[PDB]
Amino acid sequence: ALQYFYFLRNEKDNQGESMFLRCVSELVIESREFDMLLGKLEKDGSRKPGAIDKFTRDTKTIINKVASVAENKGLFEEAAKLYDLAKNPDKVLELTNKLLSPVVSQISAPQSNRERLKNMALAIAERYKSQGVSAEKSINSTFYLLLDLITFFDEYHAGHIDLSFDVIERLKLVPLSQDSVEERVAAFRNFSDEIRHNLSEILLATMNILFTQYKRLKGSGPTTLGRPQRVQEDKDSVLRSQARALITFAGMIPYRMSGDTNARLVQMEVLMN
Amino acid sequence: DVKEKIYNVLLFVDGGWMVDVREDTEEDPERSHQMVLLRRLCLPMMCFLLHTVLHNT
Amino acid sequence: RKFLASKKHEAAKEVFAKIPQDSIAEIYSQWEEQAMDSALPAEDDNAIREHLCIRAYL
Numbered sequence: 001a002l003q004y005f006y007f008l009r010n011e012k013d014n015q016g017e018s019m020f021l022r023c024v025s026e027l028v029i030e031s032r033e034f035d036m037l038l039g040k041l042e043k044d045g046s047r048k049p050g051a052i053d054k055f056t057r058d059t060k061t062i063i064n065k066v067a068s069v070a071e072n073k074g075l076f077e078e079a080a081k082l083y084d085l086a087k088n089p090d091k092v093l094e095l096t097n098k099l100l101s102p103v104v105s106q107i108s109a110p111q112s113n114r115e116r117l118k119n120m121a122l123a124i125a126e127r128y129k130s131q132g133v134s135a136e137k138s139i140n141s142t143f144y145l146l147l148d149l150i151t152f153f154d155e156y157h158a159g160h161i162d163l164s165f166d167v168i169e170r171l172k173l174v175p176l177s178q179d180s181v182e183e184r185v186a187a188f189r190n191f192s193d194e195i196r197h198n199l200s201e202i203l204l205a206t207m208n209i210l211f212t213q214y215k216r217l218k219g220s221g222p223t224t225l226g227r228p229q230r231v232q233e234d235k236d237s238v239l240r241s242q243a244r245a246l247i248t249f250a251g252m253i254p255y256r257m258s259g260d261t262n263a264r265l266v267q268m269e270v271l272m273n
Numbered sequence: 274d275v276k277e278k279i280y281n282v283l284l285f286v287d288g289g290w291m292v293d294v295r296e297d298t299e300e301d302p303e304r305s306h307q308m309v310l311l312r313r314l315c316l317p318m319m320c321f322l323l324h325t326v327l328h329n330t
Numbered sequence: 331r332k333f334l335a336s337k338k339h340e341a342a343k344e345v346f347a348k349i350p351q352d353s354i355a356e357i358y359s360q361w362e363e364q365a366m367d368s369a370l371p372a373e374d375d376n377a378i379r380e381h382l383c384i385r386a387y388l
Contacts, residue, residue, distance in 0.1 A: 260339035263322075270321035281386045291383045295372035307331045308380075314335065315387055 101194035105201035279323040
């Protein structure tokens with residue numbers, strides 16, 4: 001079919017668009033034979049040429065038009081691979097951040113969109129690390145922060161409360177002390193929208209972690225003859241101080257959280273007092 | 274305003290918040306169960322929120 | 331009731347906002363128009379009361 005459309009190489013429509021470009025764009029989308037027609041990226045990020053590279057030197061304009069038609073049809077994974085083939089790392093991580101953002105806090109289910117998008121992002125991350133490919137520092141920092149947040153929510157949903165706490169402490173996204181609140185509110189202004197959209201769920205998960213550690217401390221009845229009572233009172237005071245820092249932070253951020261989120265944060269603190 | 278609005282819940286007229294006054298209808302056991310659960314959920318929470326407001330102020 | 335039990339307060343407000351503010355007055359008006367000198371059905375009176383409880387809470 002591509003041999004026949006090459007006769008249209010000099011033909012233009014009434015708008016001046018190339019008829020060859022149009023027919024090839026329809027052909028690639030209908031056949032779904034992207035790697036064969038348009039070529040594929042290797043692990044080094046060299047492009048293996050497709051069938052179309054025989055006919056034109058401007059394969060990049062073709063791949064971008066096909067990618068835009070795939071995006072408009074809702075084929076976002078294929079559109080991301082095609083924009084990447086259009087030699088755009090920056091675009092890969094930008095689109096992957098947009099795709100990961102709504103699924104970060106979700107519970108992992110077998111065959112879920114979250115698990116598929118996570119596995120896609122991990123495969124991109126492993127390959128870009130092995131090839132030494134870096135996008136723009138802003139986009140790249142957002143991408144790895146979304147991956148670390150997926151790990152935080154995996155450990156949280158697995159019930160590994162102490163490991164999920166160590167991850168959120170390392171990420172420095174939320175204040176774990178009253179003194180850190182102003183610094184973190186200032187830092188919040190520099191986060192991307194993809195991270196800001198997840199902040200309500202991060203605060204709820206972090207507050208649930210603190211509340212569950214507090215319940216474990218109170219439910220450990222007095223039957224271990226040998227732990228000094230002062231170390232328990234000090235740890236209770238610290239968890240309540242951390243919980244207060246999260247609420248003070250949630251109230252100071254220039255971001256309108258859901259009314260249910262703020263109500264649940266305050267309700268968990270009242271149950272810790 | 275918060276104090277007034279939480280008192281309108283805690284002091285809701287004629288037998289209290291989420292309680293039927295008219296018993297001359299068929300019993301919906303699913304509805305009556307859900308209302309009792311919401312009372313156990315919402316009323317302690319409202320009391321703790323009001324305590325928190327009054328204590329911090 | 332389901333949204334309140336699930337702590338989805340914003341979803342419960344969105345449902346509450348779908349109900350027109352005149353809905354209670356309209357229920358009384360329609361009952362009066364049916365030429366019934368009787369009190370409202372116990373179901374509808376309890377449903378009005380339940381709605382006012384949810385309003386005060388939201």
